[PDB]
Amino acid sequence: GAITVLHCELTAEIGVTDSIVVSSELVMPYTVGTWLRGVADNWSKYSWLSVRYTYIPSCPSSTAGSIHMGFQYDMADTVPVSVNKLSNLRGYVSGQVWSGSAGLCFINNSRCSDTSTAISTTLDVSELGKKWYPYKTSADYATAVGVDVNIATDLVPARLVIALLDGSSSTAVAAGRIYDTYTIQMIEPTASALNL
Amino acid sequence: GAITVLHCELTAEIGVTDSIVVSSELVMPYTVGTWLRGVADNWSKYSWLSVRYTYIPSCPSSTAGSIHMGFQYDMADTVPVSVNKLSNLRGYVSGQVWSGSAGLCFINNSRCSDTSTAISTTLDVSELGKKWYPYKTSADYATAVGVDVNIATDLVPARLVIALLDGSSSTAVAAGRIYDTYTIQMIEPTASALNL
Amino acid sequence: GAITVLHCELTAEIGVTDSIVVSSELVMPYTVGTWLRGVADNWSKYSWLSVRYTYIPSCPSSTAGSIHMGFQYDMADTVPVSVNKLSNLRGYVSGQVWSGSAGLCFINNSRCSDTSTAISTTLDVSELGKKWYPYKTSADYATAVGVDVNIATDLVPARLVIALLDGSSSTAVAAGRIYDTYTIQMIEPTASALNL
Amino acid sequence: GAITVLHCELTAEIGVTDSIVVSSELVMPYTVGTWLRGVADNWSKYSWLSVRYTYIPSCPSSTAGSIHMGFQYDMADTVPVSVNKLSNLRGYVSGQVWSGSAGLCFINNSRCSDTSTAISTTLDVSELGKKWYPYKTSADYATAVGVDVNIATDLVPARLVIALLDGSSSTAVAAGRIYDTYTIQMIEPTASALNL
Amino acid sequence: QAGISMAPSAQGAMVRIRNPAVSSSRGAITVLHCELTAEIGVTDSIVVSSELVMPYTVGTWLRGVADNWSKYSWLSVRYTYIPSCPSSTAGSIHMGFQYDMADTVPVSVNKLSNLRGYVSGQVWSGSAGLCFINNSRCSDTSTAISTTLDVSELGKKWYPYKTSADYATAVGVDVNIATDLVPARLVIALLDGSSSTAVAAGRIYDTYTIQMIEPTASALNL
Amino acid sequence: QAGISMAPSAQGAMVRIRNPAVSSSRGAITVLHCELTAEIGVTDSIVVSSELVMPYTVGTWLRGVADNWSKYSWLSVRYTYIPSCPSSTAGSIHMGFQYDMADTVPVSVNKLSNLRGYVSGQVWSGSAGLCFINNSRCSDTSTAISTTLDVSELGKKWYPYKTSADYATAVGVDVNIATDLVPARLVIALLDGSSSTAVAAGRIYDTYTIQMIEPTASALNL
Numbered sequence A, B, C, D: 001g002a003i004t005v006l007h008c009e010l011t012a013e014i015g016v017t018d019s020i021v022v023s024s025e026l027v028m029p030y031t032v033g034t035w036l037r038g039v040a041d042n043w044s045k046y047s048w049l050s051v052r053y054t055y056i057p058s059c060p061s062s063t064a065g066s067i068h069m070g071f072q073y074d075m076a077d078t079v080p081v082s083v084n085k086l087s088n089l090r091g092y093v094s095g096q097v098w099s100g101s102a103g104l105c106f107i108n109n110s111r112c113s114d115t116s117t118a119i120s121t122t123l124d125v126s127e128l129g130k131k132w133y134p135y136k137t138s139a140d141y142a143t144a145v146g147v148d149v150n151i152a153t154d155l156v157p158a159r160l161v162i163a164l165l166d167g168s169s170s171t172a173v174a175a176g177r178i179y180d181t182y183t184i185q186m187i188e189p190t191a192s193a194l195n196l
Numbered sequence E, F: 001q002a003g004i005s006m007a008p009s010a011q012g013a014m015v016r017i018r019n020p021a022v023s024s025s026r027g028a029i030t031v032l033h034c035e036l037t038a039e040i041g042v043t044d045s046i047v048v049s050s051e052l053v054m055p056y057t058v059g060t061w062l063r064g065v066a067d068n069w070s071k072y073s074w075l076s077v078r079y080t081y082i083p084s085c086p087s088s089t090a091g092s093i094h095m096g097f098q099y100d101m102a103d104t105v106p107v108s109v110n111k112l113s114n115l116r117g118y119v120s121g122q123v124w125s126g127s128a129g130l131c132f133i134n135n136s137r138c139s140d141t142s143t144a145i146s147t148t149l150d151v152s153e154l155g156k157k158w159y160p161y162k163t164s165a166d167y168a169t170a171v172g173v174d175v176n177i178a179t180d181l182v183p184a185r186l187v188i189a190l191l192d193g194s195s196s197t198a199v200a201a202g203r204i205y206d207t208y209t210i211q212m213i214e215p216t217a218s219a220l221n222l
């Protein structure tokens, strides 16, 4: 009954400016990437076997700026407001917007050489609070969270906080992209139209 | 520690009309049936070890109509509106409203040889959200869900949806009944009067 | 010492109407059937080694109606008034009034392969109150019970309750018959004329 | 088919005065305690695997008075009228209303150290006159017993006689509570509403 | 000697709490400690009280330490009653656990006696449970009024660190939202006393072992 | 430690009587048992009471068993007092035996103190005698309030089983007729109390070993 998918897809496009810009992505099928969003909808519940976010650069070596990533686990906790608080989170990694190429091996599965320079981080699936979560659409999530954020705890495993700053322009400059590489188990099918 | 009970009881009475009529039942002690609702209330939490719904006919071989059953696990998902949509659910099982007698052996657990025609489905007890669920009353559940449906995922493991159509009359004709056969582990006793 | 008999005989004739009609039969030699009543009277006490009631139809596949059976053990308990209440008893077994032929093999004890549809239930001969029960006549039992019902627990091991409903006519239609297949051990001979 | 429950619950609240006050409790589910009373009703018959009554104090060390307990087995026998006769009964134990704390280990199952000071006594389940008794409500019992007490023999295994005296007040002073710790086997389910 | 007991005039128990034990394994950090958790007083009528078993409310120290981690798991939680009155004091204490916050709080020792971890005892006894708090070698704990959480049967393993404030708000929307945030609550009942006015009976200490994971600046933790 | 004593607030003694031991040798059948024999209460003035030491009156069980035999002989008879009040209770108990039913019952602890088997003690003590009843291994019975019959010095060995009724009639003709039927009587005195009204003090248990001979249908035994 468990049907397993392994895949790496574009999860977010990154631009860097001269000011801190904190953003976050829920670590659930619907938000992880559009491809998964579409396939996972045909199933009622899932379990993350492995989730790794890897940043791959697209800018010139002359591009100033740094990216910082880390995880949060209680949606009710406040999202880091400074890059300082961010550095306290689990899974913190911080790189420079033009580096990270060695991480490419995580995206195309070829054998990785030295990945100490890859700006990549992974989710601690075993310390998550439950193994089988329900597939949620961001819309429905939003509504729930609107009543009380604590309703999110039963619905989503974690949140990926990203921070970009130290750039040189007041206007966004294309830095790179964050790709997500996951192994997921999907169970109990459903027509997607009913999945909220 | 745990106190295990295996039992069978009437869970619902069924009637066929000439138009689709989808209905559902929460898979929790309180609603599985009257007897279980009663004994289960003396414990605080429980865990399903086995749950099986078996439809048994009571109409003549000439009764037009068909029955359909399946499970859903995110109380927030839309309930099916058609046989096609329903056929996708886990544990889907369809059949003539006058068929299904072979499932009798599941009820008074005897030797089941002829079970290829039994209109009986089983809950995937291991892929459920968690192990120990709290005993809830229809009333309390109802209120919670009235705030936000997602508050339900923390309380009920699944719901059985039932659809009946293909009947001959626009007014309901008696078809059969759905019986539930479960094995449940209960823990943390409480005076029933306190249990909501 | 003991004299063992295994036999099968007609125990009751059945008819369906459009309203519930719960009836019951004491599980004692005198009432199980005419033949046993006759031979059993030549012994003072007896012990059931096996008792099985099997319903066998005699109506067309188009006959509306359903049959229900179960056991009760405290003659003082109220007899069921509905299918729900009845479905809780031990050995509950329900089915279409025109179904049940697979149970024939229990009657003339042959090889039973297709028994998943047999509307047949069995007495839990080992959890009975005691082993040796005295042979009683309907008359004598009746009087005793007329003083106080509890006087019955010392004399009869159980009673089979039968409920028929879902019929189409308000006037009884012939459905089928209930046959009893038992194995009994008898001891302490007596001239039958003395046996009350 | 045998479903087993193990539990310890409050069975009686004790007050002491300056005069002998003899009381008794039938050793049957219905009277043993309200929790059991409610769960055991869903089953037709039971068997006691173990029954132990333990008194736990709640008064000051300065509380004068003694409790005496013992068993009776033929409901027709006269209830002890003096504490003397009481001391002849099987299972006799007599303690002082402020002592008995060591018996707490019987109530919460923690490992018992030295229980020679616990005012506790147990039922000789093997010398009982039958193993499977019918669940009876005190109301129905009363009626039966009203016709002739001997009808009780077939219905209940034993009776716990309690005597409290030697207190210092003409008016009851709260001494302690008697908790019952049992292991019971329940068989042949029934809707509780029918159980008398 | 077997069967004999002597009621003392008063029991004495010298509580001496040792330094908290903290240590980080790989991923998980573990704390072990004891804290005074509640004060107790008796009356002639029954009075039921409850305490949620979550870091924030279990103890004043724990509250501030646990806040630096995102989630936690209880390895062990024990409540022990230590008396502070003479054997002449009337009254009894009763404890037990409830696991569905929506359930009604017990209103009698009869209902109470059915709960998981139930324990009763004279308001003037229980010094035997001292070894649990002091950390000494336990002798005969037969007469201790102490109970413990059945951690293995709890709803889930990892719970989020919550502040009473945020919790209180959640629960205000619907009490069932609590199920997802807190594992259980200790219920405490006291009665059998002699004054209509409360009489100080004793106090309750909590001894626990908790596992904490996934760090976060405290300020962000709600 | 030598010379030091600590008065407790109250003494506790958990009485648990075991199954009677009966066995037939050749001619003689022997019973061994314990029965609660009397209830005790104190007052500020002296109150003397007596109990005949014969099967019929020694115990309610013995009474009915011994009746199936024509004669008997006491192998051992012991009376032990077990308290049921606190050490704050005023009062003392005194026991002794008399052997000529015609003699006057003592009217003072002074006369009483001269009797065979005399024992005194605070109405709130005596738990040390528990081992005699419970059948446990006796430790320091130094402070037990328990006394025993001097069976070897009794008037004769075999006495006839008598019912209180028939005895009472005999004695009514002349008390000296008792000498031939009963071996002795226990005298009990209580005083030193504080209420003019009796205050429950404790109770007395009797532990005996008796030999019974020459069977008879019970109905004939008077």
Ligand SMILES: [Ca+2]
Binding pocket: A130, A154, B130, B154, E156, E180
């Ligand atoms: Ca959850």
Ligand SMILES: [Ca+2]
Binding pocket: A044, A134, A135, A136, A137, A195, A196, B074, B076, B077
């Ligand atoms: Ca969904």
Ligand SMILES: [Ca+2]
Binding pocket: B044, B134, B135, B136, B195, B196, E100, E102, E103
């Ligand atoms: Ca509940």
Ligand SMILES: [Ca+2]
Binding pocket: C044, C134, C135, C136, C195, C196
């Ligand atoms: Ca007869």
Ligand SMILES: [Ca+2]
Binding pocket: C130, C154, D130, D154
């Ligand atoms: Ca009987």
Ligand SMILES: [Ca+2]
Binding pocket: C074, C076, C077, D044, D134, D135, D136, D137, D195, D196
């Ligand atoms: Ca009954």
Ligand SMILES: [Ca+2]
Binding pocket: A074, A076, A077, E070, E160, E161, E162, E163, E221, E222
């Ligand atoms: Ca938090």
Ligand SMILES: [Ca+2]
Binding pocket: F070, F160, F161, F162, F163, F221, F222
């Ligand atoms: Ca005589």
